[PDB]
């Protein structure tokens, strides 16, 4: 297993048609997972499955600019289960990140950070065993 938190460099940033694939297994009794697409210290796209927010499961997405979190986007569809292997695919498209989990479309997140070619790292953290993190141009 990869060491978590894990930093995957994204050389020259992201671009439409870049597909990022994360394979891992949720820990038993997980509380949270995060994918952070970073532009330096800014987080262009935070994808945050929360396993227990007031005894509900939700995905929170947001952007962090100059150390401040913005307006959350929430998705109640929650495909992750404690103990189970998952695949997250993040396809960069011209206006959004498009996320599929286990081959099913989950959500899209509109680009708030405009300089896609400066979003040069993906941080992967939280309550998983991380199997692999990779990208390809489709
Ligand atoms: C106001 O709270 C923040 O909201 C931000 C989004 O607007 C971020 O999600 C930030 O997340 C982390 O800092 C974070 C996320 C994942 C990891 C592995 C490490 C760090 C933080 O969330 C929690 O503290 C939070 C609040 C209530 C919750 F039930 C669950 C969470 N949470 O998952 O962090
Ligand atoms: Cl920008």
GROMACS .gro file of C-alpha atoms and ligand atoms in nm:
model
  173
    1UNK     CA    1   0.000   0.000   0.000
    2UNK     CA    2   0.110   0.362  -0.069
    3UNK     CA    3   0.175   0.584   0.233
    4UNK     CA    4  -0.114   0.817   0.317
    5UNK     CA    5  -0.112   1.112   0.298
    6UNK     CA    6   0.018   1.061  -0.059
    7UNK     CA    7   0.127   1.340  -0.300
    8UNK     CA    8   0.088   1.266  -0.672
    9UNK     CA    9   0.266   1.534  -0.881
   10UNK     CA   10   0.059   1.646  -1.185
   11UNK     CA   11   0.333   1.777  -1.417
   12UNK     CA   12   0.236   2.103  -1.581
   13UNK     CA   13  -0.094   2.094  -1.401
   14UNK     CA   14  -0.419   1.954  -1.526
   15UNK     CA   15  -0.581   1.996  -1.865
   16UNK     CA   16  -0.902   1.876  -2.024
   17UNK     CA   17  -0.883   1.505  -2.116
   18UNK     CA   18  -0.656   1.420  -1.820
   19UNK     CA   19  -0.801   1.128  -1.622
   20UNK     CA   20  -0.682   1.069  -1.266
   21UNK     CA   21  -0.754   0.729  -1.113
   22UNK     CA   22  -0.737   0.647  -0.743
   23UNK     CA   23  -0.771   0.288  -0.622
   24UNK     CA   24  -0.798   0.209  -0.255
   25UNK     CA   25  -0.999   0.043   0.018
   26UNK     CA   26  -1.191   0.234   0.285
   27UNK     CA   27  -1.076   0.151   0.638
   28UNK     CA   28  -1.326  -0.008   0.875
   29UNK     CA   29  -1.512   0.259   1.074
   30UNK     CA   30  -1.383   0.538   0.840
   31UNK     CA   31  -1.462   0.898   0.924
   32UNK     CA   32  -1.330   1.096   0.626
   33UNK     CA   33  -1.135   1.086   0.299
   34UNK     CA   34  -0.989   1.380   0.102
   35UNK     CA   35  -0.863   1.437  -0.247
   36UNK     CA   36  -0.699   1.781  -0.274
   37UNK     CA   37  -0.605   1.910  -0.621
   38UNK     CA   38  -0.364   2.184  -0.525
   39UNK     CA   39  -0.233   2.499  -0.686
   40UNK     CA   40   0.050   2.571  -0.448
   41UNK     CA   41  -0.115   2.626  -0.109
   42UNK     CA   42  -0.457   2.675  -0.272
   43UNK     CA   43  -0.690   2.379  -0.310
   44UNK     CA   44  -0.855   2.406  -0.650
   45UNK     CA   45  -1.077   2.104  -0.582
   46UNK     CA   46  -1.131   1.939  -0.242
   47UNK     CA   47  -1.336   1.617  -0.268
   48UNK     CA   48  -1.426   1.508   0.086
   49UNK     CA   49  -1.640   1.205   0.165
   50UNK     CA   50  -1.765   1.247   0.526
   51UNK     CA   51  -1.884   0.920   0.683
   52UNK     CA   52  -2.039   1.079   0.993
   53UNK     CA   53  -2.156   1.440   0.978
   54UNK     CA   54  -2.445   1.441   1.227
   55UNK     CA   55  -2.484   1.065   1.159
   56UNK     CA   56  -2.525   1.127   0.781
   57UNK     CA   57  -2.283   1.039   0.498
   58UNK     CA   58  -2.217   1.327   0.251
   59UNK     CA   59  -1.957   1.431  -0.002
   60UNK     CA   60  -1.835   1.788   0.052
   61UNK     CA   61  -1.654   1.966  -0.231
   62UNK     CA   62  -1.489   2.308  -0.200
   63UNK     CA   63  -1.196   2.532  -0.295
   64UNK     CA   64  -0.942   2.690  -0.058
   65UNK     CA   65  -0.798   3.029  -0.169
   66UNK     CA   66  -0.541   3.220   0.041
   67UNK     CA   67  -0.615   2.977   0.329
   68UNK     CA   68  -0.995   3.037   0.320
   69UNK     CA   69  -1.252   2.773   0.233
   70UNK     CA   70  -1.527   2.889  -0.006
   71UNK     CA   71  -1.892   2.783  -0.055
   72UNK     CA   72  -1.934   2.406  -0.009
   73UNK     CA   73  -2.103   2.196  -0.276
   74UNK     CA   74  -2.277   1.888  -0.120
   75UNK     CA   75  -2.368   1.554  -0.277
   76UNK     CA   76  -2.587   1.321  -0.072
   77UNK     CA   77  -2.520   1.026  -0.311
   78UNK     CA   78  -2.250   0.837  -0.123
   79UNK     CA   79  -2.102   0.536  -0.301
   80UNK     CA   80  -1.823   0.459  -0.046
   81UNK     CA   81  -1.857   0.187   0.220
   82UNK     CA   82  -1.630   0.124   0.514
   83UNK     CA   83  -1.413  -0.183   0.448
   84UNK     CA   84  -1.470  -0.188   0.068
   85UNK     CA   85  -1.246  -0.128  -0.235
   86UNK     CA   86  -1.324   0.172  -0.452
   87UNK     CA   87  -1.213   0.341  -0.771
   88UNK     CA   88  -1.232   0.719  -0.802
   89UNK     CA   89  -1.190   0.858  -1.154
   90UNK     CA   90  -1.156   1.235  -1.192
   91UNK     CA   91  -1.177   1.346  -1.557
   92UNK     CA   92  -1.078   1.706  -1.617
   93UNK     CA   93  -1.325   1.865  -1.860
   94UNK     CA   94  -1.325   2.223  -1.994
   95UNK     CA   95  -1.567   2.363  -1.732
   96UNK     CA   96  -1.545   2.109  -1.446
   97UNK     CA   97  -1.389   1.814  -1.279
   98UNK     CA   98  -1.609   1.513  -1.351
   99UNK     CA   99  -1.600   1.240  -1.082
  100UNK     CA  100  -1.709   0.877  -1.123
  101UNK     CA  101  -1.685   0.622  -0.842
  102UNK     CA  102  -1.691   0.251  -0.924
  103UNK     CA  103  -1.764   0.338  -1.292
  104UNK     CA  104  -2.081   0.540  -1.202
  105UNK     CA  105  -2.097   0.915  -1.246
  106UNK     CA  106  -2.113   1.088  -0.909
  107UNK     CA  107  -2.071   1.468  -0.945
  108UNK     CA  108  -1.907   1.749  -1.130
  109UNK     CA  109  -1.735   2.053  -0.980
  110UNK     CA  110  -1.709   2.370  -1.182
  111UNK     CA  111  -1.360   2.523  -1.213
  112UNK     CA  112  -1.315   2.807  -0.964
  113UNK     CA  113  -0.935   2.808  -1.006
  114UNK     CA  114  -0.887   2.906  -1.370
  115UNK     CA  115  -0.514   2.834  -1.408
  116UNK     CA  116  -0.553   2.460  -1.467
  117UNK     CA  117  -0.188   2.427  -1.570
  118UNK     CA  118  -0.084   2.538  -1.218
  119UNK     CA  119  -0.289   2.269  -1.036
  120UNK     CA  120   0.023   2.058  -1.009
  121UNK     CA  121  -0.029   1.824  -0.713
  122UNK     CA  122  -0.297   1.583  -0.591
  123UNK     CA  123  -0.293   1.508  -0.219
  124UNK     CA  124  -0.476   1.191  -0.108
  125UNK     CA  125  -0.550   1.162   0.266
  126UNK     CA  126  -0.781   1.014   0.525
  127UNK     CA  127  -0.919   0.680   0.622
  128UNK     CA  128  -0.812   0.456   0.331
  129UNK     CA  129  -0.558   0.198   0.235
  130UNK     CA  130  -0.428   0.349  -0.089
  131UNK     CA  131  -0.350   0.096  -0.363
  132UNK     CA  132  -0.256   0.326  -0.655
  133UNK     CA  133  -0.282   0.680  -0.781
  134UNK     CA  134  -0.212   0.753  -1.149
  135UNK     CA  135  -0.317   0.958  -1.451
  136UNK     CA  136  -0.347   0.917  -1.827
  137UNK     CA  137  -0.449   1.144  -2.117
  138UNK     CA  138  -0.762   1.011  -2.295
  139LIG     C1  139  -1.531   2.345   0.822
  139LIG     O1  140  -1.470   2.217   0.805
  139LIG     C2  141  -1.382   2.213   0.697
  139LIG     O2  142  -1.460   2.210   0.579
  139LIG     C3  143  -1.376   2.216   0.463
  139LIG     C4  144  -1.468   2.223   0.344
  139LIG     O3  145  -1.547   2.339   0.347
  139LIG     C5  146  -1.289   2.092   0.457
  139LIG     O4  147  -1.371   1.978   0.433
  139LIG     C6  148  -1.210   2.072   0.584
  139LIG     O5  149  -1.162   1.937   0.568
  139LIG     C7  150  -1.047   1.912   0.623
  139LIG     O6  151  -0.990   1.993   0.685
  139LIG     C8  152  -1.006   1.771   0.605
  139LIG     C9  153  -1.084   1.677   0.536
  139LIG    C10  154  -1.039   1.548   0.520
  139LIG    C11  155  -0.919   1.507   0.572
  139LIG    C12  156  -0.870   1.367   0.553
  139LIG    C13  157  -0.841   1.600   0.638
  139LIG    C14  158  -0.883   1.730   0.654
  139LIG    C15  159  -1.293   2.091   0.711
  139LIG     O7  160  -1.385   1.980   0.733
  139LIG    C16  161  -1.391   1.929   0.856
  139LIG     O8  162  -1.320   1.966   0.947
  139LIG    C17  163  -1.506   1.837   0.876
  139LIG    C18  164  -1.615   1.889   0.944
  139LIG    C19  165  -1.725   1.809   0.973
  139LIG    C20  166  -1.722   1.679   0.934
  139LIG     F1  167  -1.832   1.604   0.959
  139LIG    C21  168  -1.617   1.620   0.867
  139LIG    C22  169  -1.511   1.703   0.837
  139LIG     N1  170  -1.399   1.646   0.763
  139LIG     O9  171  -1.412   1.542   0.700
  139LIG    O10  172  -1.289   1.703   0.778
  140LIG    CL1  173  -0.674   3.101  -1.103
   0.00000   0.00000   0.00000
